[PDB]
């Protein structure tokens, strides 16, 4: 019947105060939460943040709201949320967030005869996380998400997850292009500020870099220019005016890689791991041009010394550079 | 009990005016403040501003709000803030700011039986600060933050900090990549406009540049091109058609450094300290090409003069450039 329900809700709201949390003098409230993740949009190493969109749910139990005469479990419109009590809940490591308001504001009110209240949301959050780029790009990032109450202390409100094998779903929906997902952890603390002890639930997960792309970008140029710096050893010195045309170009090419490839890179002050790598390949083409520099000063003394340099040459650069790889590719992995 | 409190609040708001500040005819109000800083996001030298996020707190004491019958210290919902008096408070050197409204608007109301009212906020502020880039990048920046009332003069309202060794916390949480934090100062003034004298509290702190990065960017190119401008002195003049190929390239390379490295730089009209440095290394490779220019005009007169030029040459450039460093790296530090 339509008749029972309208006067039933009005009995539940006549004299219902909105300014106070339930069980005010007595025991603290026991609020559980639940998160379903839709997707993670993008990760900016420039701004050290990321953007996701979740489904945010909450339980609590108010004795002020307890119908009796209806066996059904109710469902109301979102405009009743301005006439009820909700707990204050905010995100700690965020920078900008909002609630989707496409046709209405996406929030859900659901009731139960005991007083169990379900409160859904749909929030897009730009949350910031600090990054360590010492091992860039062979890195593992741990970007987190923390949830707090704001006004109430731990004497009034009690956060808890709804089971560690639960309450975080939608994991395999996450498709980052650049990264990959590893692990989940769930945290419950008691953080104490200058006012008082506050509860906190935290969400944390690893991020692993997909390595199989930057070889195409960074490494395969710097592989080949080492080999193009080795052309001169098989070049007989009759093109002594044209040997340097290689030796200028390769040193110039590393400068372009130092700069034009830098345009696709973030900006930190401390030294990245690829910077030591680009320091290493820059030194060899700097020394490969210093092959001919010692040629032209003592070639006039004797060519017999200059006849033996390419015996010295092509037995050093294809091993010091190869051992430079095994220092590089093993100190990290 | 639930029964006492609801009628207690209604006695506190029946006939409570919102249009007037407490102790209206009498003495001025005595409002204290308190700031906790979460993080500083980014510093734009392009826009001369920075972005932080704080916890903003206030005290005052209204005799209109004084319950008696409850030994507890209360805590209310943020919707009661539209039915109370708050002091007008704004930031002076800002450009755009807002209040986080993730699930609710993050503000806190807390009461006490005497009338002590605590009012919390959570504000992200893009505040502008002027920069001096004479000593770029070996600079110290003093970006500030000032807080004023808006409508009330000093006859009504009185700002004060809650102890100089207090009221600014969260210092070591600040992690800028580029900068570093030095010192804190706290200011209380009496600023007078055309209307009347208004109070002000100000927050100020130094910013020191992390120097150990721009060597990798700016200096180590300009170090090496000076040495690559010294290759020709050990080059015997048989490659007189190929000496100039060095001398064109290095002068061209400084032009790229003048332009492509300029793409990663701000824009001011007055001369930066690195600009005098890039002026200096540009002159030497301009004069190193003017070595061979005086070669080819009087080589036909005698080679005996041209036999002595590299005796003149490599005893001047490795000292005038080295003394150019000691003028540079000591006039600043």
């Amino acid at each position, epitope marked *: 019947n339509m008749s029972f329900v309208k006067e039933t809700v009005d009995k539940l709201l006549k004299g219902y105060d909105i300014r106070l949390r339930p069980d005010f003098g007595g025991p603290p409230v026991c609020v559980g939460m639940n998160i379903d993740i839709a997707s993670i949009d993008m990760v900016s190493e420039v701004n050290m943040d990321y953007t996701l969109t979740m489904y945010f749910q909450q339980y609590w139990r108010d004795k002020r709201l307890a119908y009796s005469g209806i066996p059904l479990n109710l469902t109301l419109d979102n405009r009743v949320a301005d006439q009820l009590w909700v707990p204050d809940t905010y995100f700690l490591n965020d920078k900008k967030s909002f609630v989707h308001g496409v046709t209405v504001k996406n929030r859900m009110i659901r009731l139960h005869p005991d007083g169990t209240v379900l409160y859904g949301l749909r929030i897009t959050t730009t949350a910031a996380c600090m990054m360590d780029l010492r091992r860039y790009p062979l890195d593992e990032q741990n970007c987190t998400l923390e949830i707090e109450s704001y006004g109430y202390t731990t004497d009034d409100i009690e956060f808890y997850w709804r089971g560690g094998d639960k309450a975080v779903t939608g994991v395999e929906r996450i498709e980052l292009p650049q990264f990959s997902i590893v692990e989940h952890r769930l945290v419950s*603390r008691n953080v*104490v*500020f200058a006012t008082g002890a506050y509860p906190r639930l935290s969400l944390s997960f690893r991020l692993k870099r997909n390595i199989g792309y930057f070889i195409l970008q960074t490494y395969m140029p710097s592989i080949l220019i080492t080999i193009l710096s080795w052309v001169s050893f098989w070049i007989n010195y009759d093109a002594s005016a044209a040997r340097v045309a290689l030796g200028i170009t390769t040193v110039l090419t590393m400068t372009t890689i130092n700069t034009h490839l830098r345009e696709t890179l973030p900006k930190i002050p401390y030294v990245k791991a690829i910077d030591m790598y680009l320091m290493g390949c820059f030194v060899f083409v700097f020394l490969a041009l210093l092959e001919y520099a010692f040629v032209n000063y003592i070639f006039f003394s004797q060519p017999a010394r200059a006849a033996a340099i390419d015996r010295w040459s092509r037995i050093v650069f294809p091993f010091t550079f190869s051992l430079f790889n095994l220092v590089y590719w093993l100190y990290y992995v | 009990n639930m029964s006492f409190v609801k009628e207690t609040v209604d006695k506190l708001l029946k006939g409570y005016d919102i249009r007037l500040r407490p102790d209206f005819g009498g003495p001025p109000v005595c409002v204290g403040m308190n700031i906790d800083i979460a993080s500083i996001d980014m510093v734009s030298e392009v826009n001369m501003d920075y972005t932080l996020t704080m916890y903003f707190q206030q005290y005052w004491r209204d005799k209109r709000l004084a319950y008696s019958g409850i030994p507890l210290n209360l805590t209310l919902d943020n919707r009661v803030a539209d039915q109370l008096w708050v002091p007008d408070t704004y930031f002076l050197n800002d450009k755009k700011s807002f209040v986080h409204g993730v699930t609710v608007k993050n503000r806190m109301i807390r009461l006490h039986p005497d009338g002590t009212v605590l009012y919390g906020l959570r504000i992200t502020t893009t505040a502008a600060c002027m920069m001096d880039l004479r000593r770029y990048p070996l600079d110290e920046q003093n970006c500030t933050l000032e807080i004023e009332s808006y409508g009330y003069t000093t006859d009504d309202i009185e700002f004060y900090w809650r102890g100089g*060794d207090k009221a600014v*916390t969260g*210092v*070591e949480r*600040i992690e800028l990549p580029q900068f*570093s934090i030095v010192e804190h100062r706290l200011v209380s003034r009496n600023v007078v406009f055309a209307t009347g004298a208004y109070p002000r509290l100000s927050l100020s702190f130094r910013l020191k540049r992390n120097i150990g990065y721009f060597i990798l960017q700016t200096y180590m190119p300009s170090i090496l091109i000076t040495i690559l401008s010294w290759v020709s002195f050990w080059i015997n003049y048989d490659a007189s058609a190929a000496r100039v190929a060095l001398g064109i390239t290095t002068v061209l390379t400084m032009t790229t450094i003048n332009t492509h490295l300029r793409e990663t730089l701000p824009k001011i009209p007055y001369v930066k300290a690195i600009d005098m440095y890039l002026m200096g290394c540009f002159v030497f490779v301009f004069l190193a090409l003017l070595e061979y220019a005086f070669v080819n005009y009087i080589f036909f007169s005698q080679p005996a003069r041209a036999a002595a030029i590299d005796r003149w040459s490599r005893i001047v450039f490795p000292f005038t450039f080295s003394l150019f460093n000691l003028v540079y790296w000591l006039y600043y530090v």
Partner: nanobody
Amino acid sequence: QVQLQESGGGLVQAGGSLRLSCAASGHTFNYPIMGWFRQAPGKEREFVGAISWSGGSTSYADSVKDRFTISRDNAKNTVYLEMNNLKPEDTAVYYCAAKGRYSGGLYYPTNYDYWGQGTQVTVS
């Protein structure tokens, strides 16, 4: 997973000046801000000071304002407590600890995660 170790303490008479060593091992980037502690034999434990991990800032208790100093390393990333002007009220075993990026105000002891076996430091 941070493992710590203490060294530097012992038996020093009044007017002394020492250094202790919190040996930072394992990963570090998850726990930037570290700090020291003290504990009387009967009285409950309390706080002395903490540092920014990038070395940019220090903080101190009011009773030992301007008397202790705390080092900072980037090489081995371990910290030290160099000081002057001994005070005989400071007879306390000392400790070091660390916090996450979001774990509250610095003054409170239960907000920190890892603990080392401290050195008995006695005023004689």
